[PDB]
Amino acid sequence: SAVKAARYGKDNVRVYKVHKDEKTGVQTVYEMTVCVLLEGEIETSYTKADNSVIVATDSIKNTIYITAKQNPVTPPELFGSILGTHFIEKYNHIHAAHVNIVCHRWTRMDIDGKPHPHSFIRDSEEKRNVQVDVVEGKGIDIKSSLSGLTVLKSTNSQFWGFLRDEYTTLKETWDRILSTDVDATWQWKNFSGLQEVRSHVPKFDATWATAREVTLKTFAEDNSASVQATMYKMAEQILARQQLIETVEYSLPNKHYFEIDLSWHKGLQNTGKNAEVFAPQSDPNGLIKCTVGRS
Amino acid sequence: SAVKAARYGKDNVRVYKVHKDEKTGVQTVYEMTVCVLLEGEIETSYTKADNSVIVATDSIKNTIYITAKQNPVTPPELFGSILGTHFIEKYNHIHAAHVNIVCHRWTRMDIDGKPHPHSFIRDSEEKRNVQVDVVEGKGIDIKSSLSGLTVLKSTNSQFWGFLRDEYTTLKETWDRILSTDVDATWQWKNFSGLQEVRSHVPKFDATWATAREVTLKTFAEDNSASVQATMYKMAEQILARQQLIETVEYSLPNKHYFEIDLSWHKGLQNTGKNAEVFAPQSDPNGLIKCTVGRS
Amino acid sequence: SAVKAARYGKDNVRVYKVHKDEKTGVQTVYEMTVCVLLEGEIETSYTKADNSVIVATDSIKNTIYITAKQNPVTPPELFGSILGTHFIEKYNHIHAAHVNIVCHRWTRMDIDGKPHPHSFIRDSEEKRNVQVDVVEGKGIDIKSSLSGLTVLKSTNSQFWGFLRDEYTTLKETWDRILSTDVDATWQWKNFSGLQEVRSHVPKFDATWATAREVTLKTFAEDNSASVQATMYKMAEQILARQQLIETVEYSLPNKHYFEIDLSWHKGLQNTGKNAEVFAPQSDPNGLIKCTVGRS
Amino acid sequence: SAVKAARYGKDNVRVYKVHKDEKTGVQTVYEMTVCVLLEGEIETSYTKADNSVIVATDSIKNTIYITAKQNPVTPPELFGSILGTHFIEKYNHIHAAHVNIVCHRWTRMDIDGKPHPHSFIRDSEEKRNVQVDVVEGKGIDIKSSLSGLTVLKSTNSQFWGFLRDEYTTLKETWDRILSTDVDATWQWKNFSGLQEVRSHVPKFDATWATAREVTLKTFAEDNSASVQATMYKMAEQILARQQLIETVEYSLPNKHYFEIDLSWHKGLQNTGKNAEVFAPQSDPNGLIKCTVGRS
Ligand SMILES: O=c1[nH]c(=O)c2nn[nH]c2[nH]1
Ligand SMILES: O=c1[nH]c(=O)c2nn[nH]c2[nH]1
Ligand SMILES: O=c1[nH]c(=O)c2nn[nH]c2[nH]1
Ligand SMILES: O=c1[nH]c(=O)c2nn[nH]c2[nH]1
Ligand SMILES: O=c1[nH]c(=O)c2nn[nH]c2[nH]1
Ligand SMILES: O=c1[nH]c(=O)c2nn[nH]c2[nH]1
Ligand SMILES: O=c1[nH]c(=O)c2nn[nH]c2[nH]1
Ligand SMILES: O=c1[nH]c(=O)c2nn[nH]c2[nH]1
Ligand code: NA
Ligand code: NA
Ligand code: NA
Ligand code: NA
User: Fold this and answer.
1) Closest of D177, D128, D207, D181 to residue D288, by C-alpha
2) How far is A166 from chain C (nearest CA, A)?
3) Ligand 3, residues at Cβ distance < 6 Å
4) Quick one: how many helices (H) and strands (E) in chain A?
5) Of D14, D54, D247, the CB nearest to A4
6) Where are the domains of chain C?
7) How far is Cα C222 from Cα A13, in angstroms, rounded to an integer?
8) If DSSP states are collapsed to H, E and C, what string results for A39-85?
C-alpha cells in the first residue's frame, strides 16, 4: 500500500480580534473560526513514524493567532491568503495550505438611533466564509461564500408543468410558500500570489455585499417558476456584476410548508385560496444545486 | 405505589400562519413551535390501562392548528391563553393546560429601502417565548421571555474585588470583554381568565419590546462591575416600567474570551493594554441567575 | 425592587479522571460535565456592586478539578455530595450548593473477546446524571437519572379506547411501533449529610443498573396499552426494588412512525397488516410524564 | 452565462422498514436517511423555466419508499445501487443518480441473556454510510463508510520528534491520551452495473465489519507514534483484507485532553506521571487525513 493523498492540521480554531481607534474612541471586533490543513512531503509521518516532517497542529494553532496579531483579519479572503502563503514559504517540505474561515456576525448596536462605540449583537446565524487554497507554484484559489441566510416568501412562487407518471402525486400549484437557507459560493479567478490578492482587496467585501443583495432582491421579486429558475437568476447577476468571478454556485433547500386540510372539522376551510394555517416540515427537503459560469 | 403527578400532550408542533390584507396587498407571516400538556383526572390511563380519559396527543395537535385557524396567533400570550382555556373548558376531567410557545423571527425584507409586501428573513435565532398555565379555578399564569439574544461588548466591563483564597487564581481586571446569551423572563400578575388576558393585550408586545430595549441599552451603557450587577439593573428597569409584572428573572452565561500571551514568540505584546487577539472559549462558562421582584 | 432569588457559578466544566491500577496494569477512565451553582448571602453583588461576596466562577472551576483530584468521582451521587458540602462548609455566607453532573459513557473495548486494559468506546449517547442539592441545615437531596436511552419495539404496542370527538382523527390500533428516548429520574430520601451519603454508596450504582434494567425489560415485554401504562409499570418496579427512593419520574416522548399508504401506485399494499415501510416523524411528538411515589 | 453543473433531488428522507419472519416470530427493523440527487439534461429548468424536465423532488421521495417496499434495504450498497439505477433507466434525460444513505443503529435487545424478537436499542450514534454514484454508461461507484465511532485510549500514545521552531510551544510526550471520532471510507472498484453489484453482496457487510474490527483493534493495540502513523496501519490492513477496495481513507480528529497543573494549590501533583485529572478540550482540534491505495 501507499499514501495517495494526505493532509493535516488544526480545525475549529476560534479567533477574536479587536481594533481600537484611539482618536475616535470606537472599537471594532472580528470573530471567526479557522481551519488550516497542510500538504507536502509528509508521507513518512504516516508510513515510517517519521514526525520530523510534522509542523505540529498545536504550532499551526499558535501561527493563526500570531498571524491575526500581525495582519488584518479582514477581508477573510486576504487573511486566508496571508496565512496559507506563510506555511508554504516558511516550510520547504510543505507545498499546499488549505485555509477555511467562517466569519461570525458581530453587528454594532443602535442605542437611541446612534452607533454605540463598543457594543455588538449577533443579528443572524448567517456566516461569511472563505476557502483559500495556496499551492506552491500554482498561486491562490479563493472560493468566497455566504451560508445560513434563511428566507421565506409567502406568495409569488409556483411550481407547475413538471413530469407526471406513476411515481407522481404532487399537485401543480400557482401559489405556494417558498423558504430556503441560502448557500451561495463564488469562485475567483486564480490569483498569482499574495501581491495579486492584495491588489483586489476592495473587491472582496464589495462582491460579498453584492451577492447578498442580489440574492435577497431576486428571491423577493422573482415570481419563481421553480427554485431552479430563481437560483439561476441570482447566479447570472453575480457573474454579470463582477468580472473576476469564474463561477457562481447556489445550493438551496426547499423547506416545505404543507397545507393543512381542516374540512373534516366543521367544514373548516384552510386549503387552496383559504390557506392560512400551514405545517412547516422539518424533513424531508428538496435540495437544488446549480453551478453557473461564463458562456 | 401511586401517581403523584402526571401530565401529557403534544410537543414540537410547528405552526405557520399567514395574514393577507387584500386592500393593501401586504402579507404578514407568524411562525412558532407549540407544546401543550394537560393535567386532570387522568391517573387511570397510567394505572388501569383506561384510555377513555385520554384526549389523544394527535387530537391536541389537530386542536392547535384549528385554534390558530380561528383566532389570532399574536401576541403569543393571548394565543396560549385561548388554547389552554379551550382544553379545560372543553373537557370536564382536564383541569390544567400548560402551553409553551417559541416564536421564530420572520422579519420583513427591505428591498431598495422599502418594506416588501410578502418576503421575509430570519434575522437572528433570538426567540420570543411564553409559558401559559391555565388552571381550572386558578386563572391564567403567564411567563413571557426572550432568549438567545447574543451580545458582546469589547470594553467597559470589570471584575475586581472578589473573594481570594487558596482556590483562587483569577486576576482582577478593570478591562475585559463581556459576552452573553440573554435569557430574560418576566412573570405577569395572575389573570382571572381569558377576558382579563384580552383586556391587557396591548401590554404584551409593548412589554416584550421594553425588556429587549432595556436589556440592550443597559448591557451597552453600564460600566459593568460584574454580570450580577449589570443584570440587576436590567431587571430593576423592567419592573419599574410595567406594573403588571411581579418578577423579572435573568439567566446570563459569561462567555469567556481569554487573553493569548504571545510574548514567547519574538516578544510579541498581546496582553493587558496590548490585547488585540483573544481565544473565545466554548466551555466552561460562568452562569449567573437573579430573580428580582417588588420591595 | 429586591432580589428574591439568586444563584451563580460555573457550568459546562468538562472533567476527565484516570485510575491506574499498577499491580494489574489496567486503567479505568471517568468522564463527566459538571455544573455548580451557589446560593447564600450574595445579594449585595447584584444590588451594590459588592464583589467581596463572590467566590469567583473561575475558582469554582478550579475547585471541581481539585476535588476530583482528591476524591473519587464515582459514584456521581457521592462526588456531587462532596463537592456541594465543600462550598457550604468552606464559605460561611454560602448556604446552598447545587451540583449537576452528566456522566459520559466510556466503555472498555473487547479485543478478541478480552477486556483491553486502557482502550474505550462511547457505546451510546445515553447519560447517567445526578442533581445534588446540599443546603446548610437541610442535608443533601439527590435526584439520580438516566437519559437518552433510545429504544424501539416494532410490535406489541396498542393504542385503542381513547376519547373521540370533533377534534379527533387518530384511528385506534392494536398494532403499532413504539419508540422513545427514556428519561427516568429517581429521587432519594433526604440524607442528613455526607456521612449518610457515604453509608449508602453501594446503593447508587446498583439502583442505577436496576432502573436501566427495569426500563428495558418492561419496555420490551409489556404489551403496551399506552405509553402512560407502560411507564407506570417501570416506575412501580423501581420503587418496589429500592426503599430509599421516595419518587420515580418518567418523561417519555412518543416518536411516531407513520404508515405510508402506497396503494395509489399499482395497488401497492403497505398499510395495516401489510405495513413494512414507515416514515419516521421528526416532529411533532407526544410527550408523556408521570411521577409515581409510595401509597 | 451558462449552467456548468446542476443536480437536484430530495434530501433527509427518513425511512424505516420492518421484516417479520412468520415462522420464527422474530422481527428485524432497518432505519436510514436517504438523499437522491439527479443529473442529466435538466439545464432548461434553470434557464428557461422549463419544468417538463423535472422529476419532482416529491416524486423522488415517493420512489424511495416504493423501492424500499419492493427490494431489500440491506446491505445499503445494494439498496443505493437499485435506487440509482432506477432513475437513470426509468428516465431518458436523467443520466446520473447520486444516492447517499446513513444507516442508524437499531440493535436487538438482550433481555435475561436472550435476543428479544421485536425490541431494539440505539447503542451508539455511530453510523454506517454509503455514497452510490450510478452514471449512465459509466457503471456504479460505491464509497462505503463508518463515522461517529468515538474512542479513547488512556495511555500508549506518544507524540515526540516533530519540527520545532519559533512557532512551536508543544512539549514532546511519551505518554498521552488519544481520543478521536473515526471516519473511515473505503472505495470499491467501479462495478459494471447492478448485476455486478448483486454478485458481490456478501462482501459489503463483511468488509464493513472488517473495517470496524481493524479500526478498533489497531487503535487499541498500536503504541501510536502519531495519529498519522496509527491511521496508516488501519488503512493498510483494510486494503490487504479485501481485493475489491481501491482506496481506504481515514479522517481523524485529535480530541485533546489537557493536563491540569494543580501545584499552585498546596503543591498538588497532577502533571506528568502524576496526571489523573484532565480537561477535555471541545476546540480546537487537530484534524488528520490520509488516503491510502495500492502500490
Ligand atoms: O498525533 C498527532 N499528530 C500531529 O500532527 C500533532 N500535532 N500536534 N499534536 C499532534 N498529534
Ligand atoms: O401538503 C402537502 N404538499 C405536498 O406537496 C406533499 N407531498 N406529500 N405530502 C404532501 N403534503
Ligand atoms: O401511547 C399513547 N398515549 C397517548 O396519550 C396518545 N395520544 N395519541 N397517541 C398516543 N399514544
Ligand atoms: O485568560 C484567562 N483568563 C482567565 O480568567 C482564566 N482562568 N483560567 N484560565 C484563564 N485564562
Ligand atoms: O461577572 C462575573 N461574575 C462572576 O461571578 C465571576 N466569577 N469569575 N468571573 C466572573 N465574572
Ligand atoms: O400515519 C399517521 N398516523 C397518525 O396517527 C397520524 N396523525 N396525523 N397524521 C397521521 N398519520
Ligand atoms: O421548486 C421546486 N423544484 C423542484 O424540483 C421540485 N420538486 N418538487 N417540488 C419542487 N419545487
Ligand atoms: O496541556 C496542554 N497541552 C498542549 O499541548 C497545549 N497546547 N496549548 N495549550 C496546551 N495545554
Ligand atoms: Na514550501
Ligand atoms: Na375542565
Ligand atoms: Na456556609
Ligand atoms: Na437515463
Assistant:
1) D181
2) 6
3) B 8, 54, 56-58; C 159, 170, 226-228, 254, 286
4) 6, 12
5) D247
6) 1-295
7) 50
8) EECCHHHHHCCCHHHCCCHHHHHHHHHHHHHHCCCCCHHHHHHHHHH
